[PDB]
């Protein structure tokens, strides 16, 4: 439940702080009745490194099903809006996260297609999938996506 | 320590809040 650190091929770090990990793992689809959860990844750009400081959480505003999710709530943008204000422009939107009803997850064709069409990544972005036992995390640059590696 | 290299670079500021895409399906 501490921090998680992921690295790319250039050793650019992607840091998920401990409070974010606990929030993410609280939406693990541990039961067969559990529906999909998700939101935005919000954090800090420090050179080529990224630090995930906050996330937006699911609300009843969102369409949540067992193997599908529609992040529609207006509160997601407000979290990005307010964190930008409180941080004087240092805590910014960085990507998207959602859950998968599987132990060790990987993105599907719908996940990849929606990411290339959804997140604009003129600057680096992060995608995250919360599995029942572990996390899949990837980095987006324009239209290209690549899985990160867990730092030894 | 594992995350220390990221915190050794000063953060970047952005001009305005980002406009997240409406309806993110997955
Ligand atoms: Zn999915």
Domain ranges of chain A: 4-150
CB contact at 8 A, A113 and A146: no
Burial of A34 from C-beta contacts in 10 A (0-12 / 13-18 / 19+): middle
List A36, A44, A70, A102, catalytic entry: A36
- Measured in Å, residue A142 CA sits from the centre of ligand 1 at 21
Q: Which CATH number applies to A4-150: 3.40.1350.10, 3.30.2350.10, 3.30.70.580, 3.40.140.10?
A: 3.40.140.10
How was this one solved?
Answer: X-ray
Tell me how far apart the alpha carbons of residues A79 and A42 are, in angstroms, rounded to a whole number: 9
Tell me how far apart the alpha carbons of residues A93 and A54 are, in angstroms, rounded to a whole number: 9
Respond yes or no: is residue A123 known to be catalytic.
no
CB contact at 8 A, A122 and A102: no
CB contact at 8 A, A54 and A91: yes
Q: How far is B1 from chain A (nearest CA, A)?
A: 10
Coil, helix or strand at residue B7: helix
Helix (H) or strand (E) holding A113: helix A109-118
Beta-carbon contacts below 8 Å between A and B: 94
Q: How far apart are the first and last CA of chain A?
A: 17
- Measured in Å, residue A15 CA sits from the centre of ligand 1 at 23
């Amino acid at each position: 439940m501490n921090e998680l650190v992921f690295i790319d091929d250039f050793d650019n770090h992607v840091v998920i702080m401990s409070e974010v990990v606990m929030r993410l793992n609280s939406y693990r689809q541990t039961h067969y009745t559990s529906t999909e959860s998700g939101g935005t990844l919000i954090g800090e750009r420090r050179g080529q490194h990224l630090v995930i400081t906050h996330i937006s959480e699911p609300g009843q505003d969102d369409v949540r099903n067992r193997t599908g999710l529609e992040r529609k709530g207006i509160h997601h943008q407000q979290k990005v809006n307010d964190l930008f204000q409180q941080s004087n422009g240092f805590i910014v939107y960085l990507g998207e996260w959602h859950t998968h009803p599987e132990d060790f997850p990987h993105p599907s064709f719908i996940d990849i297609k929606s990411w290339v069409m959804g997140i604009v990544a003129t600057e680096p972005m992060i995608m995250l999938i919360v599995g029942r036992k572990d996390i899949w995390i990837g980095k987006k640059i324009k239209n290209d996506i690549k899985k990160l590696k867990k730092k030894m | 320590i594992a995350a220390a290299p990221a915190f050794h670079v000063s953060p970047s500021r952005e001009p305005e809040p980002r406009k997240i895409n409406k309806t993110m399906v997955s």
